Amino acid sequence: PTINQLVRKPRQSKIKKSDSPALNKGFNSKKKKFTDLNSPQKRGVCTRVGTMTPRKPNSALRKYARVRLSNNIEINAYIPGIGHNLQEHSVVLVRGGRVRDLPGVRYHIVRGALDTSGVDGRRQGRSLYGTKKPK
């Protein structure tokens, strides 16, 4: 607005937030801070494999799993793909990405880097779902 009314206040903006709100890290041990990490991926131990539904108007049994991470928090993840090589207690890596089936998940694991084994029922997007080249 008027100029001195902009002088005597710093003209503040509309600061964003995080979209993958993993504490980043946080410093589970030692010397707790916790910030900052900004890691692109994290390992974590999964203590159950399960499945739910979305809200309307979509309907499908989406398969998910709740997981304790390195930083010792508690979050949820939908695993993608046909078949899931996992169970209780199993380690697994994590990315981010939200799906609109519901809240109660805004992440999803990656297939093939660790215990979650690549599914070779694909040939087309083999670069994902953990697949390696067939011949």
Next chain:
Amino acid sequence: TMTDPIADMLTRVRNANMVRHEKLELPASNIKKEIAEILKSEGFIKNVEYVEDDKQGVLRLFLKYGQNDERVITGLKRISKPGLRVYAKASEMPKVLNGLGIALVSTSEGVITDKEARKRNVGGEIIAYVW
């Protein structure tokens, strides 16, 4: 109370263009007549005629129009206004409207068009665009 005379002059001017009657009245001042001579030298004005009585004014102007009655400018405004005064160098100055209009400006040596201010390599305190 009038915070600013530029507003008085340029606003009676625009309001007079939108209606298109030739003549117009206003209390005088030193800068007003100086720049009015410049506008007469632009071609944006026909003529002026000073007149005097208790105490200032009235700087009387007669405006100008085409035979098809098109307004010779399209636009107008100041720049250097109260609160936020502004200045510009001799090199830094703008060439309004790539060359058509003008940018009135004050100098250490008088009030002039912008062109004479870049040729002379003397800047100063800008007043107003017009175009």
Next chain:
RNA sequence: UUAAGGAACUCGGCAAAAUGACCCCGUAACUUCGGGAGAAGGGGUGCUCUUUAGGGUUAACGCCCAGAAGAGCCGCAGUGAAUAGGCCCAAGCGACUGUUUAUCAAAAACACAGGUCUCUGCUAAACCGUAAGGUGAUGUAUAGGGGCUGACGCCUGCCCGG
């Protein structure tokens, strides 16, 4: 008086011991802003020598009064003996401080300021008395008597058949 331990005794820390004076630092919650609060906790204190502030009293002398600074001495211990507060947190009951069962109960009871209802138009009502008489009352409904409740502030619901 009693080493070691320190409420294990115990109905219960009953009693006993510990604290205790002066000055200085400092002093939370909560609060009806007054307090709580000496909160708590913690420190110093002896005699000599030196130097200095001083105030009252006087012509002045000196007579009194009670501080500071240093420097030293001693002993385990310097308000050396005696007299002189134990504290913190939390809860119910009661607001107080006060009185009470003289010779077994001192309290959560009684009263208390406040609140409320009802009575009473003046030799007023109530009352003591047989009656005069007198209290109430040198009073005159912002006054007097009776009942119930008990500071504060939030509140004080339904039923008029008996």
Next chain:
RNA sequence: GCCGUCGAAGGUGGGACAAAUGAUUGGGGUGAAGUCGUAACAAGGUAGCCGUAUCGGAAGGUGCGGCUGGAUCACCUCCUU
């Protein structure tokens, strides 16, 4: 060698700050076609709505004032060719 000042660490204590935590508990968001009712949307079937007070299982009702963002019907009066 002894003594004195200064001196970190440790010890005693009372408070400030912050985070995790706890029986139960209040409110909120969301989900199965849940049960009860139907306040609002037109005059929403008692016009609504803002403020305040109260009562209610609850939306909400009532009460005092205020606005039309109001309608069946009509403005005192003024404006319009």
Next chain:
RNA sequence: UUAGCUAGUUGGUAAGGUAACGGCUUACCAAGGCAACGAUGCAUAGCCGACCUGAGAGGGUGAUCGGCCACACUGGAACUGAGACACGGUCCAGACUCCUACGGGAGGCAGCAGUAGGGAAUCUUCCGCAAUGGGCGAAAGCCUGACGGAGCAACGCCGCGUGAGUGAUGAAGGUCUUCGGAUCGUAAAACUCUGUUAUUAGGGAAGAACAUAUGUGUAAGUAACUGUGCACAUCUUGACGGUACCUAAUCAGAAAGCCACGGCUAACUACGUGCCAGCAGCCGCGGUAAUACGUAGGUGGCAAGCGUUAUCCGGAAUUAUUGGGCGUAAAGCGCGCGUAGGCGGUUUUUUAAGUCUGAUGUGAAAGCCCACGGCUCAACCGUGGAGGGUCAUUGGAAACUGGAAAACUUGAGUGCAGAAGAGGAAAGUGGAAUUCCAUGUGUAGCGGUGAAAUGCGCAGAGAUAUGGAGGAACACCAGUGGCGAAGGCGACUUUCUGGUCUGUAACUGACGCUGAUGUGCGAAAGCGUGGGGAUCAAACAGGAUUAGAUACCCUGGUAGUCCACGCCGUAAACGAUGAGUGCUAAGUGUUAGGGGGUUUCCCGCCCCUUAGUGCUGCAGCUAACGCAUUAAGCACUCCGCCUGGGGAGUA
């Protein structure tokens, strides 16, 4: 949603201390100091040159390279010394690890490597002192995990290629086919060249090498190059590395993939699938014929790289100085008095802080950008340029802002003569009406509803008449009329008393506008204390309707409405439009005034001019409705406010 902090604090005196000044530190006198221009306290953090992005203003970060700083297990102190309060030094205390004959002793990789540990994730326990720079020395020379330089990582940037020309048959073969044919397709096969690169063998062992010491002559100085201190000449030095590079020979044989194909987006067909498995960046696909799922074929993009995830900027004009808005879409406080601050009418003279201009210095180097040259080109390296400061110093200009001085009236205020008004506070007076009671009159219903009931009534109601009390409100007038800053103010009269409008113009001569923080007034309800209590009427009771109705309807009915002193301190406090100034078409009524003509007299009619007040309307604006001299138009100043909705005006 951090507003008071500080006592050696702040100032002085003296001394001491330090390389030096200094509350740096002691003893005394003193109570100052800092803060809305944000002290303090709180969490976060090494900074800068620069890097990324963006057209640009700007936004984000502080890797490598270079400059400054602090640190060396944590913490403290001091010696040596020019310099340290010491990174591979001590002394002390502490934690930790370890040796011990148990008395006691030892140590410190955030140096290079390397190990474990955490983590999504970051390498060889390399060769060498040839070069450059170090340290000692007279020099040779020695030490140099600095450094030269090899090795691992597609981590990134740059570059070459995985062959090229001729080759149709539209071969085989795949897929599809409306079953003719189309498609992969000069693609293959085949023919003809090449061998960048690779396989082999030679040369090169290219440069990076300049050197110091070693002999010759030459000048300064010495009595004496006898010896000394200096420019030419030869001798002699490669870790990398037998490298790079070069030269000849050999074979198209070793050397290609990833994602996506509904749109946004360049890129379509068949099968399976059937609201299932699944995709998803958005919008959304999927329930038997999916171009969106999975499979195939083909195509597009892209390339030894490609996709996803996390982060930053852009697009974002979605903090809007360049570059926004507030009638209704989020958004103008309820309104006022006024401080600090911000802005400021005209003319003249001056000043030179701001401003403009010129110069001197500086703004390290590297980097960015431009020109050039070399590495085969590029990357890269160098050179040189321009470039960059809110920068210091200094000479000039005066229009503008600013400071100082002199003058002016048009803004504002004071006057003088006037006009009006429900403007406010207190007291006083009066009529109707409701009600309560009393009395006279007189009987059987009143009152209420859509229909009823509950209630009042033979104790004679209601109705009717008289007079009495008592509280509250004031019919007509009243009108888009007035007043006031808003909330608000309507019986009348007195006392006190605030502002406004016109005309006037002598009068002072810019005294002004806005207004954070503060201060005060503020509907109705609400609260305290005390008085009053006629109606009206939350809560409540009863009746009725109703499936039910603690709701509408009806009969009663307390607080309360009322007064006074206090308190809260809000609203659809609305025109949902901040204040102030100035300019721009008319018409038409209205309210208080003013000037003039006509009239015998205007009091009547008309024309004009001020101030508020309403309606229709252009220019113009606005998304539209609409506003239109009482602007939502044209602009300036000042203030307040908004940045998706719920969560929530909650905690």
